[PDB]
Design a protein around this ligand. Structure first.
Ligand SMILES: FC(F)(F)c1ccc2[nH]c([C@H]3CCNC3)nc2c1
Ligand code: NA
Lengths: 301, 301
């Protein structure tokens, strides 16, 4: 029994974190085979970031400008190239700890584990969800840039995130490992802001299922509803629309507990309308939306 | 910015999890040097759980009755000795992945990371606190016994918890790595129940300080309280007595934010009386008690 926000074991990814220093600025890099991946804004000074030409700034730099440290060992940069907003540093030595891995781009609403680091040193891991507004509510201090998010499926680490910046709201923005930003953001010191967030409905339902599995059943009721009526509710309460795919994805949970998705949607409907009436669900007074249906199934099986 | 329940990077513990089989029972073990540590109830059969005589069951076991499997490699057991409620199996091969480690018994209120494991294979990592009633609110399915809790202070892993069982209220009980249970629990399947839980007051206060540090001040007020008046009120909300030790421990967070400990105590007193009137603190709708003063300082600073 029990339900916790739960991250993938971070060992496979810890063995890929390196320190990358360029000039005064120093952040984290991901070392895979013989390449170190890190944010391209490592090559910028405070004035550069105001309006950077990265192609122009990068051609000025050369291999020797990048100090790359893998713990106490130094790594020698033999090549540097840019892909989108990540900088790729060719090193002389391949990482003997390279795991089986893929670069994947995730969808808003999907979850991943973040290995937050400082000076190429892993310090903590936590579970995140890519918000619908393409930010993540992480925990990052100065020095975290280049920290990565990932999922593990079988033996394979799926790298999906690299931390680039904090936004003025205190949330965070980054790219996939191919350097494509998540969300309408640019690696530049300008006025950037998170758009209005919404709640990940399928995830809230999944967590209500996780609640029922764990013995929290007070919010269940005799009613059922339809996608159309519910999405009217969802839209009213700043929840993402529920699609037919979401309902399919929630299939296993609806069978394992006997609560149909539209049946559970009636529960969430009443929760959205009348509130929680002083009670909690899985120890929370908020409707938790950072658990995917897969997350619920994997932790409850 | 951001405040998340952050676990420690689990890689150093992952390299220690093995599978221990005895008869038909398989659970997890911790492989450090040439010793595998696991719950002694692995040697219990169906008819044993009520009143097992562990010395009697163990005197009957040979070394080859213990199957220890480290990944695909089978470890050969060369001895076995029971220490309190943990079995210590001598294996012929030292763990090459053995980190810097030490065994510490923790006090209620302390936090640690849990690496949930099944079949000697790590499943997830999450952060926990030792509740005042000496249970923890974990996430454990059948097969996770021998999963361990730990902190990592400067590359040294301090093992502090081994999972042994789940009490009927859905919470969990275990031992330190010397096999001494936390709280009045025994590794017998007779009815035993956790004491009434309370809220870890010193932790809530640290987390309130964390909220000020991340720029949230709405819950402060102009009042103070004596220590004793605070405790007279907090007892009535099922909060842990706050001691001078707790007040001293918060001293650095008081000085960092400019708010005297007893002033923050007045704030909490009012929070308990008012609720939150629809606001949140660091994103939760309840007062969080699973961040320690040490945790707050290490995640914020
Ligand atoms: F938005 C963004 F791209 F993430 C960003 C914004 C400001 C930055 N300042 C720097 C270094 C040089 C001066 N301080 C560190 N890197 C930055 C990156
Ligand atoms: Na219903």
């Amino acid at each position: 029994s029990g339900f916790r926000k739960m991250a993938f074991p971070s060992g496979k990814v810890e063995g890929c974190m390196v320190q990358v220093t360029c000039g005064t600025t120093t952040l984290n890099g991901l070392w895979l085979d013989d390449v170190v991946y890190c944010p391209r804004h490592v090559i910028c000074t405070s004035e550069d970031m105001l309006n950077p030409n990265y192609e122009d700034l990068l051609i000025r730099k050369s291999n020797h400008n990048f100090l790359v440290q893998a713990g106490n060992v130094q790594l020698r940069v033999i090549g540097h190239s840019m892909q989108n907003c990540v900088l790729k540093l060719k090193v002389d030595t391949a990482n003997p700890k390279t795991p089986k891995y893929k670069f994947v781009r995730i969808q808003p609403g999907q979850t991943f584990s973040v290995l937050a680091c400082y000076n190429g040193s892993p310090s903590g891991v936590y579970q995140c969800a890519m918000r619908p507004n393409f930010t993540i509510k992480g925990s990052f201090l100065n020095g975290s840039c280049g920290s990565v998010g990932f999922n593990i499926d079988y033996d394979c680490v799926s790298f999906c995130y690299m931390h680039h910046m904090e936004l003025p709201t205190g949330v965070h923005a980054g790219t996939d490992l191919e350097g494509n930003f998540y969300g309408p953001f640019v690696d530049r010191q300008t006025a950037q802001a998170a758009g209005t967030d919404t709640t990940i409905t399928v995830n809230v339902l999944a967590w209500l299922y996780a609640a029922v599995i764990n013995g929290d059943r007070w919010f269940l009721n005799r009613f059922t509803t339809t996608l159309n009526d519910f999405n009217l509710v969802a839209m009213k309460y700043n929840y993402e629309p529920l699609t037919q795919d979401h309902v399919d994805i929630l299939g296993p949970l609806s069978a394992q507990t006997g609560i149909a998705v539209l049946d559970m949607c009636a529960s969430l409907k009443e929760l959205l309308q009348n509130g929680m009436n002083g009670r909690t669900i899985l120890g929370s007074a908020l409707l938790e939306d950072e658990f995917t249906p897969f997350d619920v199934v994997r932790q409850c099986s």
